[PDB]
């Protein structure tokens, strides 16, 4: 569909939030991650202009800057069965993502977003646009099984060791 499309490598690394901010109680994981992928999908200027204009329409439609547009697209894809054009556009963009030269780093960022920001907490009910992007980065779909977490309690190897300070105000 898009031949001669090139990307500036590492252009998206500046866009990745700090891990501590990912833990913010009002962090918008979906919008921030889609912003990272949008930055990564920015065509390099060396891409021929007809292709640049062509693809920029595709990613602008699927990954708009505006929140109103992003929320509008989020609703329309909730009943994607009645939007064959979006199906085709999203399929075209998923194919672009899976061939992105830095897909491996993008997958790591997607995994960090799921690990840290709860990006995929909806698991299988992740909306259509986000799921296709994650499918493009993670081909097998194993991300739908949310991240594995530590579960500290009842661990086999943890017992109440007393340190130098804990021993000052011990109890029994």
């Amino acid at each position: 569909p898009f031949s001669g499309l090139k990307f500036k490598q590492n252009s998206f690394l500046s866009t990745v939030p700090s891990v501590t901010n990912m833990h913010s109680m009002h962090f918008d994981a979906r919008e921030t991650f889609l912003g990272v992928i949008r930055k990564a999908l920015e065509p390099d200027t060396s891409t021929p202009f007809p292709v640049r204009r062509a693809f920029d329409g595709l990613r602008a439609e699927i990954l708009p800057n505006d929140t109103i547009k992003s929320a509008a697209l989020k609703a329309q894809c909730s009943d994607i069965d009645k939007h064959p054009e979006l199906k085709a556009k999203m399929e075209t963009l998923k194919e672009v993502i899976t061939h992105h030269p830095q897909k491996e780093k993008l997958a790591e960022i997607a995994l960090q977003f799921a690990r840290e920001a709860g990006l995929t907490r909806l698991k299988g009910e992740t909306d259509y646009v986000l799921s296709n992007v994650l499918d493009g980065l993670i081909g097998d779909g194993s991300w739908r099984a949310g991240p594995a977490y530590e579960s500290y309690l009842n661990k086999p190897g943890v017992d109440r060791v007393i340190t130098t300070v804990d021993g000052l105000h011990m109890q029994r």
Binding site: T20, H23, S24, M25, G118, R121, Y149, E150, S151, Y152, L153, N154, K155, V158, R160, V165, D166, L168, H169, M170, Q171
Partner: protein, 370 residues
């Protein structure tokens, strides 16, 4: 309505979100009978919780399920929570979301087991675990400030600038009440009073809350105590005996500013607050030098705010304006913040529900709560 904050080492603070104060405090204590039982009618229950464990302290072995902010006895803690719901609040926990508290840098198992007990043994519809210093800042009306919370087991600093915490700047000392109390009974020995374990520890705690204060200048206060009688004050024991206490009543909380009194190597609470600042961004420190918020019972000593004001004015550039915020309701700021937080409509999505719990298990608490 929702039940709100407490995990206090020394005191429970229970109540309803939206109220201005906890409806029931009572100490965080479970006492077991000792050396009794002959008479048929002199107590049938094997344990007593909170109030009326203090009353029976003479015949009971009192022990706190929470030590230095960490709950170490989950059997007694479930008793205290059961007492809190059924005997103090007179509510059924299965129909009220419950908000709990935690000191920062606690063991993560502590939170996981807290959320497990709430959902499994009390079947609460939803719950939440908040950070006590964050709740103190909520209560103070601020979105900016470094809050020095100090209860019965933990004193910790949390710097927050615009609702954003700087977690790398969190400081925590396991030096609070229950170390001042234990130091005080050590220091009363040289005057002549022993106060052996448990019930007499509670007695000593009571005299600390009444007679102890922080000297603005410790050396000058010591000299005054040495050359005068004006600092001597007397306290009446439950059995009628009267003890006289002099400089011991400002040397006890002096441990906060000189932890080497009790063998600790850490810096004093003044230095630790200053060190928490200076780990924050240079552009945040001025706002943090002001908005130095006090919280917790251990900040209730007379003259502690003015001594912290003095100590932090030192260690800091003279152009910085050090301001200590010590509201009179310091002791309940944490609960007051929880009541405010649990009442906000915007917070109603932040609750962890039974549904999320049974989909994810205990560890859900980490990816839902600060």
């Amino acid at each position: 309505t929702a039940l709100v904050c407490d995990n206090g080492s020394g005191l429970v603070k229970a109540g309803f979100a939206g109220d201005d104060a906890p409806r029931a405090v009572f100490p965080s204590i479970v006492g077991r009978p000792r050396h009794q039982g002959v008479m048929v009618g002199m107590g049938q229950k094997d344990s007593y919780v909170g109030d009326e464990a203090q009353s029976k302290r003479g015949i009971l072995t009192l022990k706190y399920p929470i030590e230095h902010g960490i709950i170490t006895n989950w059997d007694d803690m479930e008793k205290i929570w059961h007492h809190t719901f059924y005997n103090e609040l007179r509510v059924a926990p299965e129909e009220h979301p419950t908000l709990l508290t935690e000191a920062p840098l606690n063991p993560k198992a502590n939170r996981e087991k807290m959320t497990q007990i709430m959902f499994e043994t009390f079947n609460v519809p939803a719950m939440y675990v908040a950070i006590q210093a964050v709740l103190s800042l909520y209560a103070s009306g601020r979105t900016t400030g470094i809050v020095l919370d100090s209860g019965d087991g933990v004193t910790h600093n949390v710097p927050i600038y615009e609702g954003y915490a700087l977690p790398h700047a969190i400081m925590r000392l396991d030096l609070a009440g229950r170390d001042l109390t234990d130091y005080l009974m050590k220091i009363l020995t040289e005057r002549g009073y022993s106060f052996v374990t448990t019930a007499e520890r509670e007695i000593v705690r009571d005299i600390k809350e009444k007679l102890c204060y922080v000297a603005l200048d410790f050396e000058n206060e010591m000299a005054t105590a040495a050359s005068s009688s004006s600092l001597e004050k007397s306290y009446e024991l439950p059995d009628g005996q009267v003890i006289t206490i002099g400089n011991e009543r400002f040397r006890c909380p002096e441990t906060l500013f000189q932890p080497s009194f009790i063998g600790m190597e850490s810096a004093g609470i003044h230095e630790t607050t200053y060190n928490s600042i200076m780990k924050c961004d240079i552009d945040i420190r001025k706002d943090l030098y002001a908005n130095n918020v006090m919280s917790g019972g251990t900040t209730m000593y007379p003259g502690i705010a003015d001594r912290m004001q003095k100590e932090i004015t030192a260690l800091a550039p003279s152009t910085m304006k050090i301001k200590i915020i010590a509201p009179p309701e310091r002791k309940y700021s944490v609960w007051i913040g929880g009541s405010i937080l649990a009442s906000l409509s915007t917070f109603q999505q932040m609750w962890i529900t039974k549904q999320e719990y049974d989909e994810a298990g205990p560890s859900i608490v980490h990816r839902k709560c600060f």
